[PDB]
Design a protein around this ligand. Structure first.
Ligand SMILES: [Mg+2]
Ligand SMILES: [Zn+2]
Ligand SMILES: [Zn+2]
Lengths: 99, 156, 1358, 73
DNA sequence: AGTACGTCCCGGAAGAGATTCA
DNA sequence: TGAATCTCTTCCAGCACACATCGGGACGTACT
RNA sequence: GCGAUGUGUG
């Protein structure tokens, strides 16, 4: 079973799990470890940012593909954004900063 | 259920086996299992199984003999106090039927066909403990009781 | 876009600034329509729309009208994203304790307030009262009281009194507390007081406070006043298929909270009575508590039927919180998975891929090339095109695939290999074809394993794969130097059969010019495959400086062997394959091939190996038949003889000659001997039975019985397995770890009788079950290790230092265990190694050590080498290159940034599975007992004696009277290799200056007795002995003798209990024997509880042992073994009964022998000696009063405490200890693991430190902070005139060094959440990224590799 | 047409600068026109670039040189 | 008649007792 | 008096699948 | 279009 681009979960804008649900695989924590072990970086950055989290960037990616412009623009992981709002729901403030 | 009495030669032999194993056979099997596990890495691989099993056995025995070397108490006494047959004695005993039987008495961790293969914690021994050239020794085997006559006491 | 993430507490006003309104109605939705209820959890006019750019009232369905809010329903209009970004709040009509701050152990609130958590609770849940500035009363401020107490107080003080109960109370408390008088008073208390636990508690408190003040926070903020609410989307009401909704727990929780708050509101305005309002507030606090962390306070509240509903805490922490569930890993588009197969026709730089599967994968790329060639205007049309699956599609698909690597993964992604890459070739069927070699790298048989595929979408990543993930570029595991392209069972069986002489076969001993024509013969069949033969061959040796000289000659070899030779690349020497090509053989074969001709030829050679292998293997047809396992004729005979022996021993037992114990033992030993005899018999009759004529008469030779072939090959199985097929299968062990007294008579060829098989059953099930629990614990270990190193990358090129550790090869006296070569290889010089010829530069000081320099060392036989190690590089926030040494898999030096951390982690991890579960660790105990009995010198050398005051025995040997003797081993140069202790009066088998070889014994003694050795010769009297009173006569049955036991004070008779018996050697008639040189006779006063054998009137020689002292001993290290032992090492668990060592160096002395831990005083040669130490007298000792010992030297005996090791000996010492212990384990199981990895682990194992003196610093003294920070600080500070600081590195177990790391989000994402997040939140611990896990979370690049280039450029820019 | 990267590393020690260099060159030869410097083989930009590299005539130096030059132009 | 709609809900390890050599 | 040595009790126990079921009841009514 | 528990696969 395979998946290119299908549904997306609702809480976290992430792909779904399983075949019956027309979802994709799971790149696992240990695999993150692995790619880290290889100097391969762009791989993992792409494979955490585009392939999963940003809706915005995901669309950008798909379009740029259809025009062959093998490229990406990271933006930010919407899931992490969710983490932020969640902890913020807890009695804790957390913010980003300037640069 | 145990007695730490040891004969000098047996203690020597214990050290001997200890070195033989932890210095020669362990490293051999070590190299062996290494080459066998040069990314073979299979639980089903009964080569690896048996090799590690030899490892387990040799380890059990080395720990046993280690604790022994620790606890065991040597008494390598001369032939000086004689007559009594307390320990470390070449002894012959005879039966009504004339069952000659000769042996020296040594420590539990020396029971082999090598030199002398009669325990000290054995019931026979317990009877033989303190007797003389002409006593009537008796024991009670799980088959019942029996008796013998002393016929010889010798030392070294 | 941004940088370092900041974290802090929550000010109520900050919350208000967050929200966009306040819910008021607990109702969820309409569920009559589906419109959300007004001003509720989902309310638009608080939160926002449902569908993009659509009002609720239905006013403006038009982008043109954006921005403006409604007036009918009054709602803003935007993208629905806002429906996620916004957040909501609640004005709780009563304050509320934040349960995190309330219950973490320690309670931040508590410590801030100095109050038992139990009573603070009793406050919160309203069963008590607490004072608030009572005034001129008989009461204390912090004081608390009960109902009747409170009432009597009220009547004792009507108005001027002041106390309350509950939230408001705690709030007023904190607001009242000033945070500067606290600093003053408590620093004063630490200055004044002395008690240790007081010091520790107070210092935790002062840390809390000073940090809190350093932040801009306000404690009362710890109490919630306006509890925010999660945005609605993230708690979505899932519309199930039906008229219901499987509500998320968050919804129900908020609902409860809202009902509670609303009842409370409605009460207060109606002045309802106090009992009611109390119950109200209590339910409220508990509800908020549930909201934050259900299940932490008493009985959790449940949800659907009986299972505790999920909470916000749950949504963060735990295996399935956001961190471990969606950030350190997650699901991913553009992927797939299937089952795998073989397809051996694939140059290993490629792999299979299922056609359907691909076509579905690359659909984007397909659409792309489609409208490039212009076969569909719109994307939709192309979607239809693909679905129809027309012809042109497939061609285009091939086109896009042609050079686009993909990634493969297996499930148990243990180590770096765990993901690799290939170039697909499109195949029919529906499975993944996969090159055979790469299996073992994947630890992946074909038992049905599933593998997954990913596809890099971007160009850079295509390069990534093709550069660092294409199996070509991985012939060596970064773990250790072995190759990883080792062929395996089939192919190797092939080669084996392909090169092995018989004695006589078709084409015997003819002659052949060209291996070509050899293969010609074979295909013709006009000549046997394997046959002795002379042939011409040609070989190429490249001795010239990069140039290949061709020579050629005749060889006595075998036909098929040549036929193989036609595939060897142009390089290697011919003799490589003259032999039989076992597994080990072909291993070395491929490996040398690599190391001598580079890479491309190596890989092409490997694939040619596989091809030709499978080919001739099949062509041979090594089957297996039953007749192919010969039962040894003598087996029946031998086992019958064994039976008779068993009967003999049984007769001995029944005749009472032995007890059941030794009965058991005798039987087992004799069966074992028999087993071995049988094994010898079978192995013989297999390996040799083939005996045939030659054109002469007969001859024996190596066999062709396929099973022995499959073994001696080394394909699978060995002597062991073929044993358990032919001979008995030995003995089996019951769960007791015992071993049954009746072995397996028969084997697998014959049939097992039931009871046997039943036994062997549990025999095997033991381990088959073990493997599960084993896997689990191993994985936990792996994870822990990764999150101690996820933030270490080699960054700068050269620290440029002159430190490091030493290396000596371990030896058992005779042969070496670890060849110094194989321990140093790949690492880099620290100093310059001098020639054995003294004062001569043998090797440069700051240079690599590769194989040729290793060989030079070997030639010169160097004892030890000082060498750099990651343990102590001077790098900041990283590790310098040269300190790390050869990255394995790449002979050259490490590249600038290949993050060693994770690779080291994995490399330690992977063998986890391959350990054993639970036994007793042995390593140090082996040599332990050895050195107890007699000294064992290591190597050849002369003899040197320190503090040698001795005496020659009657035998001429020597025994020592000085209690301070040191044995020095002299080399062939003049220094010393070994400086051994010397037990008192040991039987010296040697003498000073005697030149002795290596590995010999030089002394001897009772390992467990303090001797009473003589000093002179002459007769013996009972001089000073008190007959009967002090001494006792002890007749021992088993020894049939009595003796004189010396009774000590508490044991000897009370009459002369203080009268001390002694012994003095006398002349032939009883006079004094004055010691030669002195004026006093040689009287020796007798310590109590001793044993004396010799009696009065005995002539003795100078140097005879008189009496004996039973020296207690215990080496119960019996909690130690295997995997948990590794755990406890990296954990630094203080072992059960530690062994203590020397605080400082100098002379020692005793003190007041109070019962228990009596005393021990030490004094420097000159320095002040303010130190003493109490030591449990029941514990043994290894020192005497007059001794003068070195600091950090052994005092007690037993396990070696890492902490004190660190604080006494040195960093180098402690890292050496750890590596030796862990290496000892893995060797005891034998898994080569280069030390570098464990080294870097230790480096992280000590990344903190504490202070002794700030000097001119910016640090509180009693304070802990990372080594790196203080080092970089005081570096520049010393660059300026002002004085630096004094520090002390303090080792931490991984499960801690994790926590206290500079960063926090890592910790947050490791092993627990609440502790870390809270401590941060009070710390205001502003946090940079500077770390893998961090950036992984935020998803930007990784400072590891390519990303290391990126971050360098960025940091350079700013 | 390429199976390994060994000579590429031989020409650039980093083995990662390899990567980035290749990538920059590749984005050029896919978007920025600028036809390659070697007979192609229906191979994609990626392989094209690695091949240019092991032809010992493309690196970071040459890149930035030509970028600055064309920018002046 | 009987109800679809109302509310109502084993190991470790570290801390706070707590116990015992003073 | 106070520094050691027990002793309750919070925190974690591998990865990736596949499939399966099941998800409030209760109490009370304005009607249907 | 979520989560629980179970079963099985490696
Ligand atoms: Mg499998
Ligand atoms: Zn409206
Ligand atoms: Zn360094």
């Amino acid at each position: 079973h395979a998946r290119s681009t299908g549904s997306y979960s609702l809480v976290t804008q992430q792909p779904l799990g399983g075949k019956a649900q027309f979802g994709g695989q799971r790149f696992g924590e240990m695999e993150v470890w692995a790619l880290e072990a290889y100097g391969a970086a762009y791989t993992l950055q792409e494979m955490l940012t585009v392939k999963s989290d940003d809706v915005n960037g995901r669309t950008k990616m798909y379009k740029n593909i259809v025009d062959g412009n093998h490229q990406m623009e990271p933006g930010m992981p919407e899931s992490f954004n969710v983490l932020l709002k969640e902890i913020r729901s807890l009695g804790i403030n957390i913010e980003l900063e300037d640069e | 259920m145990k007695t730490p009495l040891v004969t000098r030669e047996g203690y020597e032999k214990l050290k001997q086996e200890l070195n033989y194993l932890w210095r020669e056979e362990r490293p051999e099997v070590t190299k062996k299992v290494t080459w066998a596990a040069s990314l073979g890495d299979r639980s089903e691989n009964a080569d690896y199984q048996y090799n590690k099993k030899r490892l387990r056995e040799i380890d059990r025995r080395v720990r046993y003999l280690t604790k022994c070397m620790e606890n065991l108490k040597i008494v390598d006494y001369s032939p000086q106090q004689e007559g009594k047959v307390f320990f470390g004695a070449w002894v012959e005993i005879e039966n009504d039927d004339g069952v000659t039987h000769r042996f020296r008495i040594v420590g539990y961790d020396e029971i082999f066909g090598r030199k002398d293969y009669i325990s000290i914690d054995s019931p026979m021994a317990r009877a033989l403990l303190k007797k003389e050239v002409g006593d009537l020794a008796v024991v009670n085997t799980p088959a019942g009781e029996a008796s013998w006559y002393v016929n010889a006491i010798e030392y070294v | 876009e941004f940088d370092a993430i900041k974290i802090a507490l929550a000010s109520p006003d900050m919350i208000r600034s967050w929200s966009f309104g306040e819910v008021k109605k607990p109702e969820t939705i309409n569920y009559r329509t589906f419109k959300p209820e007004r001003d509720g959890l989902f309310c638009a006019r608080i939160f926002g729309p449902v569908k993009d750019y659509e009002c609720l009232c239905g006013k403006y369905k038009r982008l043109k009208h954006r921005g403006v809010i409604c007036e009918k329903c009054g709602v803003e209009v935007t993208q629905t994203k806002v429906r996620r970004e916004r957040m909501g709040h609640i004005e709780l009509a009563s304050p509320t304790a934040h349960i995190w701050f309330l219950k973490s152990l320690p309670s931040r609130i508590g410590l801030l307030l100095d109050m038992p958590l139990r009573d603070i609770e009793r406050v919160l849940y309203f069963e008590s009262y607490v004072v608030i500035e009572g005034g001129m009363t008989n009461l204390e401020r912090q004081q608390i009281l009960t109902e009747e107490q409170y009432l009597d107080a009220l009547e004792e003080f009507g108005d001027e009194f002041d106390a309350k109960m509950g939230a408001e109370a705690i709030q007023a408390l904190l607001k009242s507390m000033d945070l500067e008088q606290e600093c003053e008073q408590l620093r004063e208390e630490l200055n004044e007081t002395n008690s240790e636990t007081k010091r520790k508690k107070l210092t935790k408190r002062i840390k809390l406070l000073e940090a809190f003040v350093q932040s801009g926070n306000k404690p009362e903020w710890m109490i919630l006043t306006v509890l925010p609410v999660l945005p609605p989307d993230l708690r979505p009401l899932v519309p199930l298929d039906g008229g219901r909704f499987a509500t998320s727990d968050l919804n129900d929780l908020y609902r409860r909270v809202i009902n509670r708050n609303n009842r409370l509101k409605r009460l207060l305005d109606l002045a309802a009575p106090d009992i009611i309002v109390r119950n109200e507030k209590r339910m409220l606090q508990e509800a908020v508590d549930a909201l934050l962390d259900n299940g932490r306070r008493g009985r959790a509240i449940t949800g659907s039927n009986k299972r505790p509903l999920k909470s916000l805490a749950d949504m963060i922490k735990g295996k399935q919180g956001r961190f471990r569930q969606n950030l350190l890993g997650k699901r991913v588009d553009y992927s797939g998975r299937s089952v795998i197969t073989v397809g051996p026709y694939l140059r290993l730089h490629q792999c299979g891929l299922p056609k359907k599967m691909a076509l579905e994968l690359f659909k984007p790329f397909i659409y792309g090339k489609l409208e490039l060639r212009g076969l569909a205007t719109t994307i939709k049309a192309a979607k239809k095109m693909v679905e129809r699956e027309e012809a042109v599609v497939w061609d285009i698909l091939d086109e896009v695939i042609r050079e686009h690597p993909v990634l493969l993964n297996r499930a148990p992604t243990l180590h770096r290999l765990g993901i690799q890459a290939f170039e697909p070739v499109l195949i029919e069927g529906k499975a993944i074809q996969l090159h055979p070699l790469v299996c073992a790298a994947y630890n992946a048989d074909f038992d049905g394993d599933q593998m997954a595929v990913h596809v890099p979408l971007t160009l850079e990543a295509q390069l990534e794969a093709r550069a660092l993930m294409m199996s070509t570029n991985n012939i060596l595991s970064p773990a250790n130097g072995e190759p990883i392209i080792v062929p395996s069972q089939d192919v190797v069986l092939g080669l084996y059969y392909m090169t092995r002489d018989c004695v006589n076969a078709k084409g015997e001993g003819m002659v052949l010019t060209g291996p070509k024509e050899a293969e010609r013969l074979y295909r013709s069949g006009l000549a046997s495959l394997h046959a002795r033969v002379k042939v011409r061959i040609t070989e190429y040796e490249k001795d010239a400086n990069g140039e290949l000289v061709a020579k050629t000659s005749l060889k006595d070899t075998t036909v098929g062997r040549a036929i193989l030779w036609m595939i060897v690349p142009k390089g290697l020497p011919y003799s490589i394959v003259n032999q039989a090509l076992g597994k080990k053989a072909i291993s070395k074969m491929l490996n040398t091939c690599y190391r001598i001709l580079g890479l491309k030829p190596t890989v092409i050679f490997a694939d040619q190996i596989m091809y030709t292998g499978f080919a001739y293997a099949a062509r041979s047809g090594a089957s297996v038949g039953i007749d192919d396992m010969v039962i040894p004729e003598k087996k029946h005979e031998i086992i019958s003889e064994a039976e008779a022996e068993v009967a003999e021993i049984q007769e001995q037992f029944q005749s009472g000659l032995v007890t059941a114990g030794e009965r058991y033992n005798k039987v087992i030993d004799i069966w074992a001997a028999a087993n071995d005899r049988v094994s010898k018999a079978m192995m013989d009759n297999l390996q040799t039975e083939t005996v045939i004529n030659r054109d002469g008469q007969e001859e024996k030779q190596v066999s062709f019985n396929s099973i022995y072939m499959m073994a001696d090959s080394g394909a699978r199985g060995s002597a062991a397995q073929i044993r358990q097929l032919a001979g008995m299968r030995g003995l089996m062990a019951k769960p007791d770890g015992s071993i049954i007294e009746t072995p397996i008579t028969a084997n697998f060829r014959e049939g097992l009788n039931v009871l046997q098989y039943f036994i062997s059953t549990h025999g095997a099930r033991k381990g088959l079950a073990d493997t599960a629990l084993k896997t689990a614990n191993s994985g936990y270990l792996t994870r822990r290790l990764v999150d101690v190193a996820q933030d270490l990358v080699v960054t700068e090129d050269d620290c440029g230092t002159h430190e490091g550790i030493m290396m000596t090869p371990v030896i058992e006296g005779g042969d070496v265990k670890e060849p110094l070569r194989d321990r140093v290889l790949g690492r880099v010089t620290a100093e310059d190694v001098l020639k054995p010829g003294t004062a001569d530069i043998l090797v440069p000081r700051n240079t690599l050590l590769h194989e040729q320099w290793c060989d030079l060392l070997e030639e010169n036989s160097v004892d030890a080498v000082k060498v750099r190690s990651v343990v102590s590089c001077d790098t900041d926030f990283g590790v310098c290159a040269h300190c790390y040494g050869r990255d394995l898999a790449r002979g050259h030096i490490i590249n600038k940034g290949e993050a060693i951390g994770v690779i080291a982690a994995q490399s330690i991890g992977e063998p986890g599975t391959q350990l054993t579960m639970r036994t007793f660790h042995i390593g140090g105990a082996a040599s332990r007992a050895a050195a107890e009995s007699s000294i064992q010198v290591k190597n050849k050398g002369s003899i040197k004696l320190s503090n040698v005051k001795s005496v020659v025995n009657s035998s001429g040997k020597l025994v020592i009277t000085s209690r301070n003797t040191e044995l020095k081993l002299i080399d062939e140069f003049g220094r010393t290799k070994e400086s051994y202790k010397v037990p008192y009066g040991a039987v010296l088998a040697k003498g000073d200056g005697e030149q002795v070889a290596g590995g010999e014994t030089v002394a001897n003694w009772d390992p467990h007795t303090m001797p009473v050795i003589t000093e002179v010769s002459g007769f013996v009297r009972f001089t000073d002995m008190i007959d009967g009173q002090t001494i006792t006569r002890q007749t021992d049955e088993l020894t049939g003798l009595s003796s004189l036991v010396v009774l000590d004070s508490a044991e000897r008779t009370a009459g002369g209990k203080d009268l001390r018996p002694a012994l003095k050697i006398v002349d032939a008639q009883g006079n004094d024997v004055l010691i030669p040189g002195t004026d006093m006779p040689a009287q020796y006063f007798l310590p109590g509880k001793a044993i004396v054998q010799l009696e009065d009137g005995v002539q003795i020689s100078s140097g005879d042992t008189l009496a004996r002292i039973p020296q207690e001993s215990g080496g119960t290290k019996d909690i130690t073994g295997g995997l948990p032992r590794v755990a406890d090492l990296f954990e630094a668990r203080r072992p059960k009964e530690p062994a203590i060592l020397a605080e400082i160096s100098g002379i020692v002395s005793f003190g007041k022998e109070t019962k228990g831990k009596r005393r021990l005083v030490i004094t420097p040669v000159d320095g002040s000696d303010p130190y003493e130490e109490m030591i449990p007298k029941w514990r043994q000792l290894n020192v005497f009063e007059g001794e003068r010992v070195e600091r950090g030297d052994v005092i007690s005996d037993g396990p070696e405490a890492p902490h004190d090791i660190l604080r006494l000996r040195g960093v180098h010492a402690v890292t050496r200890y750890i590596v030796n212990e862990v290496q000892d384990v893995y060797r005891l199981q034998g898994v080569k693991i280069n030390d570098k990895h464990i080294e870097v682990i230790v480096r992280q194992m000590l990344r903190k430190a504490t202070i002794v003196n700030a000097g001119s610093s910016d640090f509180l003294e009693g304070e802990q902070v990372e080594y790196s920070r203080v080092k970089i600080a005081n570096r520049e500070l010393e660059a300026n005139g002002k004085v630096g600081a004094t520090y002390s590195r303090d080792l931490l177990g991984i499960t801690k060094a994790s926590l206290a790391t500079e960063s926090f989000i890592s910790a947050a994402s490791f092993q627990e959440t609440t502790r870390v997040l809270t401590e941060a939140a009070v710390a205001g611990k502003r946090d940079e990224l500077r770390g893998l896990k961090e950036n992984v979370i935020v998803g930007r690049l990784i400072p590891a590799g390519t990303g290391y280039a990126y971050h360098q450029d960025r940091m350079r820019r700013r | 047409a390429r199976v390994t990267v060994q000579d590429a590393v031989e020409k650039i020690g980093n083995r990662f600068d390899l990567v980035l260099v290749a990538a920059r060159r590749a984005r050029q030869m896919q978007v920025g026109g600028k036809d390659p410097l070697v007979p192609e083989e229906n191979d994609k930009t990626t392989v094209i670039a690695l091949r240019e590299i092991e032809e010992g005539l493309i690196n970071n130096q040459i890149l930035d040189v030509r970028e600055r030059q064309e920018q002046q132009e």
